[PDB]
């Protein structure tokens, strides 16, 4: 039978009998209200279930209905714009259908709606008898104005097409393909189902080559991430995380966005779910909602501990499904520290050996195996395509202690750290990225891209990092030397470090000219600031060696208009001024500064 | 609809051990069911089914297991879990930690019966916090301001006045009265000694505020399960009053440190192994089930705001109870031993205290337009004043500048006038802000660098 | 080359048989086919964490930081599968690689490995932050077999004396550098400034090298003497007068 029966209850643990063919880690529905749980032990014809919901009122002899599956995702049309929790309950459909402010115990709404009808177009040259394999695109659903949703044959499925549906409107429960292999027939609808703990297969996993642009001058120049990359950010109150989340959502070269809350505070989760629907972007000269290309997983701190832990596996499995269509995906996890605390609580319920700081022995392997799902890929199946998933995971070191087991593991794994900083936010220095603590390890992989497309940039990045580091060495000298007694070369360093810091690293995201900064504007600004620095250094070092010296005071007194034009470069608007117009103006500052230095020399 | 079937009574007690009675031959045992025991002398006790297995049930008795035997003791299984009657008639009433009346009024007529475990609020239905809750205490309202739908703990230690502060917040709290009968309080107190419990009950009658207040008292020698039930009765009442009767409810939960001591005991009675620092491994998920019964919700005009109150051992903020509370709640109000020793009341220390939602509660149309600027400038002056006061003992007062002597004058008058307040003195936010400006006027207006020129122009000068 | 690969997404219990498959292959090549074999084992830290994961699931006795109570004896069955044998012309050399958690050499993985292996090469975050390469710090590092692999007819006669005097000068230079952080440069004596000059020249000339530069032992020893001559010969108190008189005047 599909039913066993409750033999006993002790807190969240249920023991059931007549469970003989039930497999390890299957999901089950317990009692007359159908509470969800998972099988954690087998013994004889009995099973031990870890129930996710309150077991209060469950009785001996109550039905235990078994699902033949582990924890898994419905993958199909209806995911874009959706709100889910960590076990894929549709929070907005539950709200709409129940007319309640609460989540009912043992609620059993399907994650994708089976009453919405979708416009479906088949792949045109598939016919009865066509040979078809896992990952093959056999039709497209027009889900909205932005996302064409590509219907694929599941992994671990293959055969010869015995039926394919004509163009039309279909429920997610309608059969749209049948195929046959070894005389056995498989019938398929628009929804496939996949286990959250199994990595979705690919033809090949590839090195990451192309930047994940954000439109920020810092990040995109000094600390780049690739498409398929991995990043961590500090998750703390004052630092200002939202610039990462909103730049990814509005301005990245991602095709799809997945956001995971994984045990957040109720009032913080409410702020995300209020704010995200109000975000918009301009597509083909028309403004569109972010929720046409976005899905949210949301979990407050009083959701089931099984959901708070499943959350990142639900979010990465959704991300891998859109990668397999040939999209580029960014996934954000709102705090991996809240996920790790849920993992710790589960190991505590299981009475496991407490290892490092009370966290289970597998913590670092679970983090490693999760971040190993990031990357660029060659997809399974016939139409030849590439996709990627890029992961940003926030992490919350207690009091800023990076020796925390979750933070220590995370920075041991990730290839970028964007160190957002409360002290910079208190200075009104926005975006609040600390350039001393932050790093990127993708700078070699991007070398071929920058060489091909920009060519001048790698030298400029190298000089700019040195100038910002020299100022941090000169500061302790200035505290003794009293600024005036410093060398003129080093006064140039300090004041150009201030020029880069105030006019390149800072970027006011509320202002129309600086909401997004394209990479041509970014390299153009830096090119001029470093050109000015080299000419100012050359004027001092040519004269001060034996002639009547030039000084940084003489340069400022002679060149104050050039220095004002340099501070004005950030005000150029990429929408009102064309690429060629901005480039021509930035060439005019180079001509003007070269003329001004030639008149000084 | 109704439960309708007659009850079964068993004399099938197999064994008795610690707080637990074990019965066999029980018909389809229900987990967490309430049962009534009658003892050999006719005394009555009650308990709850702690585990079931086949025909066996084990009951934790709320009162003792003394005088119980296997032969004459009978147990009546009621057929159902714990549900509380709930109504608006509960405002003006005093109850014990099992919901029984202790005020010589009658027992509650239900408008409904609710399961005390509740259900989680859907994240889609919770809307962001907004306007102020006015506590009447300047160190809170002026600088650690509380939003409708916030949750914010008071952190304290043994022998500090946190119950006198809680009682003052209960007597004084309300809405700001800009330019209501829709405000109520649920006050819950866990593991209270009889001196403290008599103080709470006496102080709210004597100072005549009971018509807004539902009060639940659990004493230090009441059953430890009634301490587990007490926050759940209180929050099941606040959920009826807020999300069905559309009130703004303030909930005060007193010694969550006493609650955790009972949680550790019920965990030990289940024969679980002790977790990290000796508390149950699931204590985060348990505390989060209390603290997230809070907020504003879409389409209903009520809200629940929580003020948990906690005692820390060794004055240590890194113990599991304050530490896990910090991951769930959004701020802290810090009660200080040094201000208490200096004879200041309320001894609230504003430098480590924070309300993370303060910007959502304050400003034009919610308090007054200058509130954010005054709060920022009072914090900035006090943080400098404590630093000048430290260097005065190193450099001597003759090495201090004229500006150091202004911070040294502000520091004394801030603590005597802004922080120091009577236990029966109630200041509106407007009075709090006016006391704030009397202190800022100690300085030349060039010193007030956290305040913009528009706010200085409207509020720095005195007027008739 | 032979490669056995288990990745971050492959099963964690394969990791406890992976190095035993590699060492069984090395034993056939060395002790039946008479090859010389070099064996590289990558994150023994991942092996030891997979061993902790398995042993915790069996409820076996814990040692320090929850590692298996027998982990020394287990790691010894891996590391002792090395060396030479009488009458056979092959050999196995093992170079395992460890990640020390939070950089702590006293953590159970580096601790029990250092009790079994014939020394260690130690890679230092502070040298890497300063952009020195290779980031090898000599003071925590050891070779137990060095003492009888060097000297006359083995390498060069000075090798042991040079090595021990470089250890002494580097250790004293590091103690002057710690002292100067308290007292400042103005308090140093002229002898302190010699050890502090040696420290700076040693890290630039001896330690720093670059990824395809390939120095002989003789080049290494002559770089060594160019740094030891910073001092008067009377300060070279590890070196006997016979070695000084022959090699120092150059």
């Amino acid at each position: 039978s599909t039913f066993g029966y409750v033999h006993g209850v002790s807190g969240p643990v249920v023991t059931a009998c007549d469970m003989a063919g039930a497999a390890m880690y299957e999901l089950v529905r317990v009692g007359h209200s159908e509470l969800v749980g998972e099988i954690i032990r087998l013994e004889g014809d009995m099973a031990t279930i870890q129930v996710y919901e309150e077991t209060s009122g469950v009785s001996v002899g109550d039905p235990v209905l078994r699902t033949g599956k582990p924890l898994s995702v419905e993958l199909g049309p209806g995911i874009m714009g959706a709100i889910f929790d960590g076990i894929q309950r549709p929070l907005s459909d539950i709200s709409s259908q129940t007319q309640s402010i609460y989540i009912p115990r043992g609620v059993n709404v399907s994650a994708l709606s089976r009453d919405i009808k979708w416009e479906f177009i088949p792949s045109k040259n598939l016919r009865v008898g066509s040979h078809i394999t896992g990952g093959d695109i056999y039709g497209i659903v027009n889900e909205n104005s932005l996302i064409k949703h590509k219907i694929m044959l599941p992994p671990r499925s293959r055969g010869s097409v015995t039926y394919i549906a004509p163009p039309g409107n279909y429920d997610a429960s309608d059969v749209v393909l049948e195929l046959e292999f070894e005389g056995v027939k498989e019938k398929l609808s628009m929804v496939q189902v996949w286990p959250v703990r199994q990595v979705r297969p690919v033809t090949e996993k590839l090195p990451a080559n192309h930047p994940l642009l954000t439109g920020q001058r810092v990040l995109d120049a000094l600390f780049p991430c690739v498409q398929g990359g991995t990043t961590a950010i500090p998750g703390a109150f004052g630092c200002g995380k939202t610039v990462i989340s909103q730049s990814l959502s509005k301005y990245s070269n991602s095709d799809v966005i997945i956001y995971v809350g994984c045990g957040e505070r109720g009032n913080e989760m409410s702020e995300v779910l209020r704010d995200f629907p109000e975000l918009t972007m301009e597509v083909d000269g028309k403004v569109e909602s972010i929720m046409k290309r976005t899905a949210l997983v949301a979990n407050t701190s009083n959701m089931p501990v099984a959901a708070r832990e499943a959350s990142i596996y639900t979010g990465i499995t959704l991300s891998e499904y859109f990668r397999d269509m040939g999209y580029h995906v960014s996934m954000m996890a709102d705090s991996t520290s809240r996920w790790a605390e849920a993992l710790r609580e589960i190991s505590g319920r299981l009475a496991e050996m407490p290892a490092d700081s009370g966290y289970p022995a597998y913590l670092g392997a679970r983090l490693a195996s999760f971040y190993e799902r990031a990357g660029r890929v060659k997809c399974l199946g016939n139409p030849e395509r590439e996709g990627s998933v890029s992961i940003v995971g926030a992490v919350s070191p207690p009091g800023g202690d990076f020796s925390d087991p979750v933070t220590s593991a995370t920075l041991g794994i990730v290839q970028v750290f964007w160190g957002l900083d409360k002290k910079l936010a208190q200075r009104k220095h926005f975006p609040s990225v600390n350039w001393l603590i932050s790093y990127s390890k993708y700078m070699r992989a991007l070398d071929e891209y920058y060489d091909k497309h920009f060519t001048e940039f790698v030298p400029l990045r190298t000089k700019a990092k040195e100038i910002l580091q020299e100022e941090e060495d000169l500061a302790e000298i200035v505290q003794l030397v009293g600024k005036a007694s410093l060398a003129e070369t080093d006064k140039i360093t300090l004041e150009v470090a201030k020029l880069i810091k105030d006019d390149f690293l800072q970027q006011n995201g509320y202002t129309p000219y600086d909401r997004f900064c394209p990479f041509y504007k970014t390299v153009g600004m830096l090119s001029n600031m470093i050109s000015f620095y080299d000419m100012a250094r050359r004027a001092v070092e040519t004269t001060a060696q034996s002639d009547n010296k030039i000084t940084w005071s003489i340069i400022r007194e002679h060149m104050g208009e050039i220095l004002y034009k340099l501070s004005s470069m950030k005000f150029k608007d990429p929408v009102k001024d064309g690429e060629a117009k901005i480039k021509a103006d930035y060439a005019q500052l180079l001509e003007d500064m070269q003329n001004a230095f030639r008149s000084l020399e | 609809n109704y439960l309708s079937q007659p009850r079964l009574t068993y004399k099938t007690v197999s064994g008795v051990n610690g707080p637990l009675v074990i019965l066999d031959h029980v018909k389809f045992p229900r987990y967490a069911e309430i049962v009534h025991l009658t003892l050999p002398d006719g005394t009555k006790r009650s308990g709850q089914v702690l585990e079931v297995s086949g025909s066996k049930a084990v009951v934790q008795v709320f009162e003792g297991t003394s005088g119980i035997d296997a032969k004459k003791t009978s147990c009546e299984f009621t057929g159902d879990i714990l549900r509380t009657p709930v109504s608006e008639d509960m405002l003006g009433r005093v109850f014990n930690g099992s919901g029984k009346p202790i005020d010589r009024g009658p027992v509650v007529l239900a408008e409904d019966f609710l399961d005390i475990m509740g259900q989680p609020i859907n994240p889609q239905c919770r809307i962001y916090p907004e306007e102020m809750i006015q506590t009447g205490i300047s160190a809170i309202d002026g600088m650690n301001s509380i939003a409708r739908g916030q949750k914010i703990p008071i952190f304290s230690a043994a022998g500090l006045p946190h119950n006198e502060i809680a009682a003052q917040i209960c007597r004084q709290a309300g809405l700001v009265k800009k330019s209501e009968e829709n405000f109520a309080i649920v006050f819950a107190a866990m593991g209270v000694n009889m001196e403290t419990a008599r103080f709470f009950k006496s102080d709210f009658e004597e100072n005549g505020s009971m018509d807004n207040v539902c009060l639940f008292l659990n004493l230090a020698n009441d059953p430890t399960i009634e301490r587990i039930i007490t926050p759940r009765l209180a929050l099941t009442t606040a959920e009826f009053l807020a999300y069905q009767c559309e009130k703004h409810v303030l909930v005060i939960l007193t010694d969550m440190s006493s609650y955790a001591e009972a949680l550790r005991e019920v965990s030990a009675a289940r024969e679980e192994v002790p977790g990290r620092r000796g508390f149950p491994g699931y204590m985060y998920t348990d505390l989060a089930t209390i603290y997230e019964r809070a907020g504003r919700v879409e389409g209903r005009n009520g809200s629940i705001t929580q003020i948990p109150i906690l005692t820390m051992p060794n004055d240590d903020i890194t113990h599991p109870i304050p530490d896990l509370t910090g991951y769930i709640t959004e701020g802290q109000i810090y009660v200080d031993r040094q201000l208490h020793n200096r004879q200041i009341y309320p001894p609230i220390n504003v430098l480590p205290s924070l309300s993370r939602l303060m910007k959502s509660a304050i400003g034009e149309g919610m308090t007054r337009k200058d509130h954010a600027d005054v709060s920022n400038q009072l914090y900035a002056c006090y943080a400098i004043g404590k630093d000048v006061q430290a260097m005065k003992a190193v450099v001597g007062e003759e090495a201090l500048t004229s500006d150091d002597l202004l911070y040294l004058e502000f520091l004394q008058k801030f603590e005597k006038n802004f922080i120091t307040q009577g236990p029966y003195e109630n200041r509106t936010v407007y009075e709090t802000l006016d006391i704030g400006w009397q202190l800022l006027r100690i300085f030349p207006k060039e010193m007030l660098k956290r305040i913009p020129q528009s706010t200085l122009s409207e509020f720095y000068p005195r007027d008739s | 080359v032979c490669l056995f690969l288990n990745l971050a997404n492959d099963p964690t219990i394969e990791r406890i048989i992976t190095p035993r498959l590699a060492l069984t292959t090395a034993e056939f090549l060395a002790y039946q086919c008479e090859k010389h074999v070099l064996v590289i084992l990558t994150d023994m830290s991942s092996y030891a964490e997979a061993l902790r994961e398995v042993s915790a699931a069996r409820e076996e006795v814990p040692g320090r930081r929850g590692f298996p109570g027998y982990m020394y004896t287990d790691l010894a069955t891996i590391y002792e599968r090395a060396g030479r044998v009488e009458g056979r012309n092959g050999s196995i050399t093992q170079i395992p690689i460890l990640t020390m958690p939070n950089d702590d050499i006293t953590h159970p993985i580096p601790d029990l490995t250092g009790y079994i292996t014939e020394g260690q090469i130690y890679v230092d975050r502070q040298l890497h932050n300063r952009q020195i390469y290779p980031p090898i710090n000599v003071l925590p590092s050891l070779s137990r077999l060095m003492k009888s692999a060097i000297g006359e007819g083995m390498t060069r006669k000075d090798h042991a004396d040079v090595s021990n005097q470089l250890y002494a000068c580097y250790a004293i230079g590091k103690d002057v550098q710690a002292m100067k952080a308290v007292v400042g440069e103005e308090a140093l004596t002229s002898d302190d400034l010699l050890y502090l000059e040696f420290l700076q020249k040693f890290e630039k000339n001896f330690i720093t090298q670059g990824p395809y530069e390939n120095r002989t032992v003789y080049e290494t020893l002559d770089i060594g003497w160019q740094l030891l001559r910073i001092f008067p010969k009377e300060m070279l108190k590890r070196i006997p007068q016979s070695t000084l008189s022959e090699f120092y005047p150059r």
């Binding site: 009475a351 050996m353 407490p354 | 024969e271 192994v273 002790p274 | 409820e59 006795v61 814990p62």
Partner: peptide, 25 residues
């Protein structure tokens, strides 16, 4: 923690032996 487990196991074994003895009786 390791000493408080093992006590749980030895108690579980004693219960199972007592249940087997009640099946013998």
């Amino acid at each position: 923690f390791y000493r408080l487990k093992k006590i749980q196991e030895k108690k579980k074994i004693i219960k199972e032996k007592s249940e087997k003895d009640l099946e013998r009786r």
